[PDB]
Design an enzyme around this catalytic site. Structure first.
Site, mmCIF file in Angstrom:
data_model
loop_
_atom_site.group_PDB
_atom_site.id
_atom_site.type_symbol
_atom_site.label_atom_id
_atom_site.label_comp_id
_atom_site.label_asym_id
_atom_site.label_seq_id
_atom_site.Cartn_x
_atom_site.Cartn_y
_atom_site.Cartn_z
ATOM 1 N N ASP A 15 -10.532 -5.834 0.373
ATOM 2 C CA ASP A 15 -9.092 -5.631 0.409
ATOM 3 C C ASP A 15 -8.325 -6.756 -0.267
ATOM 4 O O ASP A 15 -8.134 -7.815 0.325
ATOM 5 C CB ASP A 15 -8.662 -5.539 1.880
ATOM 6 C CG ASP A 15 -7.180 -5.304 2.056
ATOM 7 O OD1 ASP A 15 -6.517 -4.943 1.074
ATOM 8 O OD2 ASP A 15 -6.696 -5.434 3.205
ATOM 9 N N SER B 217 4.825 -4.700 -13.554
ATOM 10 C CA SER B 217 4.542 -3.666 -14.533
ATOM 11 C C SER B 217 5.748 -3.502 -15.455
ATOM 12 O O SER B 217 6.893 -3.714 -15.055
ATOM 13 C CB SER B 217 4.215 -2.348 -13.827
ATOM 14 O OG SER B 217 4.147 -1.264 -14.741
#
Length: 330
Positions: free
Chosen positions: A35, A199
């Site tokens: 994770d 992004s």
């Protein structure tokens, strides 16, 4: 040194991925959920409340000759899905794919929440976010990667998750046969303890690319792709009959649909998520309403590039002095 381990979806939907991890001496092999959104290595154990164990493999520290109680140390963690676990701490030898760390903090669960109990396939978590998020008290502990870093050939790990198929986590090297084209690297902020990056925008299907900054985290421990409501609405508007259902808890769509792809930007590069990766199947057994793999982050407080996005790429988690993230098509 290096390590390389195969990671395998727990079910037919890729709801999560498990990777075998050797703990203790002789080795006890547990299947852990790697994770990159958390920083605790915790396991079901011989100390876990009996009624809260249902089919998981447990770590028994009394059977490991290298286990030592970390005296006074406790841990307690809550996750974004409302699940939680807590307990005490041992140090022991931990190996992943041939890479060994001695003195790793292994957090033994005394208590786990119902969703963990109900999932027989996940024996614990191995956190790969920054060690500043580790919950051990009163002395915070380091992640497996942080402990291994100085010994690695290069201070990196890579995630190469499969779509409805096994993939690979590598430590200490970049497998140049595992991706196509070039890797595009992008800046990371560690201020919140995550692999947090920005992004450069998105496209829906064959549509034009929208240049817009989307701050979010690369999180292998989250199943879906969580983005701003504006982006998510633009996506689902291209699927006839798709709608947001408050009763189901997100966007659903007719199972008869063919889903469009979703593209996200990494610098000047583009990662394309095929439409099929966005199908999470019937909302309940036999339903013709299907759950979407792109959902709104509104009310999470952060955008999350979970497995839906990451499995479309070869992802480099570069833990050099100034960390960065790399993305390649594959």
């Amino acid at each position: 040194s290096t390590g390389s381990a195969t990671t395998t979806p727990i079910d037919s939907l890729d709801d999560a991925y498990i990777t075998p991890v050797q703990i203790g001496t002789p080795a006890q092999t547990l299947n852990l959920d790697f994770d990159t959104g958390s920083s605790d290595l915790w396991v079901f154990s011989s100390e876990t409340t009996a009624s809260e164990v249902d089919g998981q493999t447990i770590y028994t520290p009394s059977k490991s000759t290298t286990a030592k109680l970390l005296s006074g140390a406790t841990w307690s963690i809550s996750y974004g899905d409302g699940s939680s676990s807590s307990g005490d701490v041992y140090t022991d030898t931990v190996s992943v794919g041939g890479l060994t760390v001695t003195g790793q903090a292994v957090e033994s669960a005394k208590k786990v929440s119902s969703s963990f109990t109900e999932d027989s396939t996940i024996d614990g978590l191995l956190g790969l976010a920054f060690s500043t998020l580790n919950t051990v008290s009163p002395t915070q502990q380091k992640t497996f990667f942080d402990n291994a870093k100085a010994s690695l050939d290069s201070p990196v790990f890579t995630a190469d998750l499969g779509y409805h198929a096994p993939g690979t986590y590598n430590f200490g090297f970049i497998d140049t046969t595992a991706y196509t084209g070039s890797i595009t690297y992008t800046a990371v902020s560690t201020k919140q303890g995550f692999w947090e990056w920005t992004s450069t925008g998105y496209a829906v299907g064959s549509g034009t690319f929208k240049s817009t900054s989307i701050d979010g985290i690369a999180d292998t421990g989250t199943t879906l792709l969580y983005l701003p409501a504006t982006v998510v609405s633009a996506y689902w508007a291209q699927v006839s009959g798709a709608k947001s259902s408050s009763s189901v808890g997100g966007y659903v769509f007719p199972c008869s649909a063919t889903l469009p792809s979703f593209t996200f930007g990494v610098g000047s590069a583009r990662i394309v998520i095929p439409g099929d990766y966005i199908d999470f199947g019937p909302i309940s057994t036999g339903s013709s309403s299907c759950f979407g793999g792109i959902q709104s982050s509104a009310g999470i407080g952060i955008n999350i590039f979970g497995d839906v996005a990451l499995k479309a790429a070869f992802v480099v988690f570069n833990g050099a002095t100034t960390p960065t993230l790399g993305f390649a098509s594959k």
